[PDB]
Design a protein around this ligand. Structure first.
Ligand SMILES: CCCCCCCC/C=C\CCCCCCCC(=O)O[C@@H](COC(=O)CCCCCCCCCCCCCCC)COP(=O)([O-])OCC[N+](C)(C)C
Ligand SMILES: CCCCCCCC/C=C\CCCCCCCC(=O)O[C@@H](COC(=O)CCCCCCCCCCCCCCC)COP(=O)([O-])OCC[N+](C)(C)C
Ligand SMILES: CCCCCCCC/C=C\CCCCCCCC(=O)O[C@@H](COC(=O)CCCCCCCCCCCCCCC)COP(=O)([O-])OCC[N+](C)(C)C
Ligand SMILES: CCCCCCCC/C=C\CCCCCCCC(=O)O[C@@H](COC(=O)CCCCCCCCCCCCCCC)COP(=O)([O-])OCC[N+](C)(C)C
Ligand SMILES: CCCCCCCC/C=C\CCCCCCCC(=O)O[C@@H](COC(=O)CCCCCCCCCCCCCCC)COP(=O)([O-])OCC[N+](C)(C)C
Ligand SMILES: CCCCCCCC/C=C\CCCCCCCC(=O)O[C@@H](COC(=O)CCCCCCCCCCCCCCC)COP(=O)([O-])OCC[N+](C)(C)C
Ligand SMILES: CCCCCCCC/C=C\CCCCCCCC(=O)O[C@@H](COC(=O)CCCCCCCCCCCCCCC)COP(=O)([O-])OCC[N+](C)(C)C
Ligand SMILES: CCCCCCCC/C=C\CCCCCCCC(=O)O[C@@H](COC(=O)CCCCCCCCCCCCCCC)COP(=O)([O-])OCC[N+](C)(C)C
Ligand SMILES: CCCCCCCC/C=C\CCCCCCCC(=O)O[C@@H](COC(=O)CCCCCCCCCCCCCCC)COP(=O)([O-])OCC[N+](C)(C)C
Ligand SMILES: Nc1ncnc2c1ncn2[C@@H]1O[C@H](COP(=O)(O)OP(=O)(O)OP(=O)(O)O)[C@@H](O)[C@H]1O
Ligand SMILES: Nc1ncnc2c1ncn2[C@@H]1O[C@H](COP(=O)(O)OP(=O)(O)OP(=O)(O)O)[C@@H](O)[C@H]1O
Ligand SMILES: Cn1c(=O)c2c(ncn2C)n(C)c1=O
Ligand SMILES: [Ca+2]
Ligand SMILES: [Zn+2]
Ligand SMILES: [Zn+2]
Lengths: 546, 145, 48
């Protein structure tokens, strides 16, 4: 009992489909480093995000595809975190310490930048304007403390520097994941689809058209686990579509590969700085910049840079950084996500609003023209509907925003030959534009809160009722007391499948057991048959009572 | 404490009327719907303060002459000649107005900034009034669910 | 209304076969069982 209790954390059991379609249980070791880095909170957040993406966004046949892709880039994350964990040589070691410190404290720098934006705007709340020195106006930071202007200048400099460190920290922390994802997808599409060999991509597919830059570069599979994807493509599609064409497309040297097969000298000739200017790969760097400069997060941080710099030109530009809370605190993210969930519907609704208000304009210009008087000075009438442009502007600006329809902003229709016509006009304007067509605007976000409602509830319910791996419902497992709890803590645990993949990679290929070699060969072949689907050990052995 | 302070001032006994909210069960459930998403409501009004301030920084710099609240031409009463009073004006009047801020300031007709002010008032009405108060109504709407 | 109509239609396609009506809780016992059943065995395009 003492041995088992001590090795309880490190003993990982999973179940694979195996040969002859018999579920087999596999036992292995999780190292302490693997378990610690997996329980690191950032990986927990990534796991919850992935689980939501799978259960909510759909995908039943590709669920194991998505799971293994999650396995790959999670392993990359833990490698990155292990890397960043706490003359020329002096410069290099100080530089890597600086980059590692920024990467560790990226989130705290983001919080610091938000706090600085709040402080700068709180200072700006004392701005004042006068014509006299502190036709031409003067903006002065009116204050009683006497230190507030130096505080503003110091805080502005500090904010710009912190935002720069946020850019650098992002570039050294989260960019490698984006590169890894892009090159992984490119390698899969090259090897199993031949998207640049046999089936060229579409013209409007900017991603496919941009990826051609990196094919012939000598450093294509960098920040990717394998480096032989070029050779696998050459061995697969070389004999059909042309080996020499494969070499030209992939920037490959047919003789040089065979000579590096038998002899591979590994010296370091250039010791100086000039090697960093010579060994750089210009084309790959252009492709890498193209990949990052289209990512949404990096563009947001670059715009954060631009506004921070422009805040020195004009201090009020720092107010634009207050919107960082919307990309910051999670609950504001969800509120904005409800607003933006039906964004296309909202835009089309206000388009319909413009159309119907214009349809009221064409019928107010022709008939109800004299009523649009906004001048009590009888000498100079100010007809606001003597022209299409200004009448449409009047309707869109005043009639939509009025509490009632347009009927409360124009001349009284009483005592006129068009009294009933104008009553119908104003009542239908109020009924269609005000109470109906703004209730749609309110109702889209009203229903969007139900959207995010049912998404979270569906995800949580699906975790509660069915196993993520096998799919057998809890109405089967709970026959035995705590049956589903046991099934998702011992038998099928996605953390254990994490650890199995890690353990296969770490273990020497000649030392794999039979079952591990089976799982390994279909990991390389990319055939997800070994995941138990629709079956488990308990279901397999019932007559023998498991 | 309120019962004792009611002897100091008799109107302090009005605070005991809120005992029905901790009393009758149906009022407890109505208040429970209101308070179920209380954090969401507080963050929504925080976003309201942020966006109204973002309108203040762009009304002070450009649309400054329009914020006149004095018909006495001898003594103008610019309500947006200072950040503090302009933000106070926006939060107090513009949020509570039936329309946006456009019905509480000078008419933008006949000006070089006519179209800019029209965009300003329309987006204020669309984001602050009809959207950001519909979220406030919608949190408790969904809380009844 | 339109919410629950689209969701009900999509859910009904996802869970039950359009022709036979047998639920996917039966077919998915075999891996990709429902996918196979509605791509090879009972396919309304094939009845076309
Ligand atoms: C130096 C900077 C060069 C940047 C090049 C970016 C290349 C790239 O990958 O673009 C990316 C962004 O592309 C776009 O959205 C268009 C740009 C490719 O994105 P995508 O998913 O291919 O976007 C499809 C565009 N479409 C949906 C409008 C058809
Ligand atoms: C730490 C680094 C700090 C930023 C650089 C130094 C700022 C200096 C500064 O006060 O702002 C500088 C501008 O501001 C700029 O030089 C930035 C403009 C960015 C535009 C492109 C983005 C100068 O500020 P200013 O003298 O008030 O501007 C005078 C106007 N003029 C530039 C038209 C002559
Ligand atoms: C991009 C180009 C930027 C040009 C800026 C510009 O023309 O500045 C103008 C002022 O600045 C303004 O009139 C704009 C101030 C807006 C602040 C609020 C934006 C909120 C963004 C929310 C987003 C959601 C004029 O320049 P200046 O600065 O008055 O020039 C003299 C002063 N100087 C010597 C200090 C330079
Ligand atoms: C008040 C009036 C309207 C307010 C608008 C509501 C919010 C819109 C957010 C963005 C959006 O959904 O845009 C849509 C329209 O896109 C356009 O036509 C341009 C929108 C530009 C962004 C405006 C941000 C305003 C906050 C595009 O939406 P989509 O193509 O479905 O993809 C985004 C939605 N998704 C993330 C849920 C999949
Ligand atoms: C989705 C829903 C969106 C809303 C849509 C509905 C919104 C609108 C709803 C209500 C406003 C209704 C106003 C009707 C006014 C009729 C006036 C009348 O007596 O007849 C007129 C003729 O009549 C015609 O020319 C007939 C065609 C009428 C066009 C308007 C139909 C709207 C329904 C009198 O003609 P006249 O004075 O001899 O000629 C004047 C010539 N002039 C015009 C060039 C000066
Ligand atoms: C049965 C017991 C009744 C309560 C005590 C007696 C109340 C007497 C009374 O009329 O109120 C007393 C206060 O009121 C207090 O003495 C209570 C103050 C509570 C403060 C701490 C909680 C006296 O009431 P008063 O004379 O109207 O107050 C005069 C103001 N003075 C206290 C500043 C001088
Ligand atoms: C805690 C300290 C209390 C101090 C009270 C105080 O200053 O009383 C002040 C009055 O009282 C007021 O100005 C407040 C009255 C508020 C009643 C409504 C509160 C509702 C709470 C709803 C919550 C949700 C002044 O004192 P006074 O009582 O006028 O003093 C003279 C009169 N005396 C001789 C009778 C004392
Ligand atoms: C109009 C604008 C806003 C109106 C506020 C809506 C009601 C809030 C009730 C309390 C509340 O939920 O407060 C929240 C914010 O808490 C704060 O930041 C302070 C709130 C103080 C109580 C205000 C009572 C007003 C009635 C804390 O909420 P929570 O941390 O999720 O725990 C309480 C909610 N629960 C009981 C459902 C779990
Ligand atoms: C989530 C959403 C929240 C809402 C966010 C959006 C809310 C706002 C929406 C709408 C109001 C839009 C008002 C624009 C006015 C432009 C004026 C113009 O012609 O250019 C100006 C320059 O221009 C600049 O300085 C460029 C930067 C503009 C800052 C405002 C961007 C808002 C988007 C003219 O410059 P000038 O007169 O030569 O310089 C004056 C100098 N002074 C200012 C110190 C006196
Ligand atoms: N194969 C599976 N592997 C893991 N969890 C599963 C599996 N099948 C179902 N589940 C469910 O997934 C849920 C995950 O919640 P859990 O309490 O385990 O997460 P956690 O440790 O709090 O995670 P985090 O740190 O990401 O918040 C469990 O309640 C469990 O019932
Ligand atoms: N007997 C059946 N025949 C066809 N589809 C069926 C049948 N039973 C269930 N289905 C479901 O119908 C769905 C139809 O979606 P599918 O992805 O096949 O359509 P599609 O090719 O994209 O169609 P379209 O071109 O009309 O958009 C499938 O997801 C499938 O599960
Ligand atoms: C599937 N796979 C990986 O996912 C992997 C790896 N080496 C590192 N990783 C992440 N190897 C060798 C591998 O076969
Ligand atoms: Ca061996
Ligand atoms: Zn399972
Ligand atoms: Zn069928």
């Amino acid at each position: 009992e003492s041995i088992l209790e001590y090795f309880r954390p490190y003993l990982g059991r999973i179940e694979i489909m195996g040969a002859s379609r018999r579920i087999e249980r596999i036992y292995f070791e999780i190292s302490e480093t693997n378990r610690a880095q997996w329980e690191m909170p950032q990986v927990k957040e990534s796991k919850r995000q992935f689980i939501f993406d799978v259960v909510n966004e759909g995908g039943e046949a590709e669920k194991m595809e998505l799971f293994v892709s999650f396995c790959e880039d999670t392993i990359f994350e833990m490698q990155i975190a292990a890397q960043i964990s706490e003359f020329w040589g002096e410069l290099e070691v100080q530089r890597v310490k600086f980059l590692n410190y920024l990467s560790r404290n990226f989130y705290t720098l983001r919080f610091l930048a938000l706090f600085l934006a709040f402080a700068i705007n709180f200072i700006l709340l004392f701005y004042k304007v006068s014509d006299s020195p502190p036709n031409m106006v003067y903006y002065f930071l009116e204050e009683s403390t006497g230190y507030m202007e130096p505080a503003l200048w110091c805080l502005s400099l500090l904010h710009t520097l912190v935002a720069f460190l946020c850019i650098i920290g992002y570039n050294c922390l989260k960019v490698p994941l984006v590169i890894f994802k892009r090159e992984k997808e490119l390698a899969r599409k090259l090897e199993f689809d031949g998207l640049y060999i046999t089936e060229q991509p579409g013209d409007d597919d900017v991603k496919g058209q941009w990826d051609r830059l990196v094919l012939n570069t000598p450093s294509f599979p960098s920040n990717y686990w394998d480096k032989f994807v070029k050779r696998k493509v050459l061995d697969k599609h070389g004999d059909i579509f042309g080996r020499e064409r494969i070499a030209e497309l992939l920037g490959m040297d047919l003789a040089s590969l065979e000579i590096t097969a038998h002899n591979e000298r590994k010296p370091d000739p250039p010791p100086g700085l000039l090697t960093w200017l010579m060994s750089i790969d210009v084309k790959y760097q252009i492709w890498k910049f193209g990949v990052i400069f289209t990512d949404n997060s990096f563009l947001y941080l670059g715009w954060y840079m631009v506004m921070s710099l422009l805040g020195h030109y004009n201090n009020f530009f720092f107010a634009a950084h207050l919107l960082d809370i919307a990309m910051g605190v999670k609950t504001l993210r969800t509120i904005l996500s409800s607003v933006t969930h039906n964004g296309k519907q909202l835009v089309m609704t206000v388009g319909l609003l413009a159309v119907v208000v214009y349809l009221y304009t064409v019928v107010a210009f022709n008939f109800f023209r004299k009523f649009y008087n906004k001048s009590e000075d009888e000498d100079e009438p100010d007809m606001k509907c003597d022209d299409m442009m200004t009448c449409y502007l009047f309707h869109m600006y005043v009639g939509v925003r009025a509490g009632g329809g347009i009927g409360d902003e124009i001349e009284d229709p009483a005592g006129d030959e068009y009294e009933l016509y104008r009553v119908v006009f104003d009542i239908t304007f109020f009924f269609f534009v005000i109470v109906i067509l703004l209730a749609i605007i309110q109702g889209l976000i009203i229903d969007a809160f139900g959207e995010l409602r049912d998404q979270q509830e569906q995800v949580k319910e699906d975790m509660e009722t069915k196993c993520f791996i096998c799919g057998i419902g809890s109405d089967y497992f709970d026959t035995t007391p705590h049956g589903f709890e046991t099934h998702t803590l011992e038998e099928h645990n996605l953390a254990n499948y994490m650890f199995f993949l890690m353990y296969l990679i770490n273990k020497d290929e000649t030392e794999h057991t039979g079952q591990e070699s089976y799982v390994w060969k279909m990991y390389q072949e990319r055939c997800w048959d070994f995941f138990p689907a629709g079956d488990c050990f308990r279901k397999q052995y019932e007559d023998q009572l498991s």
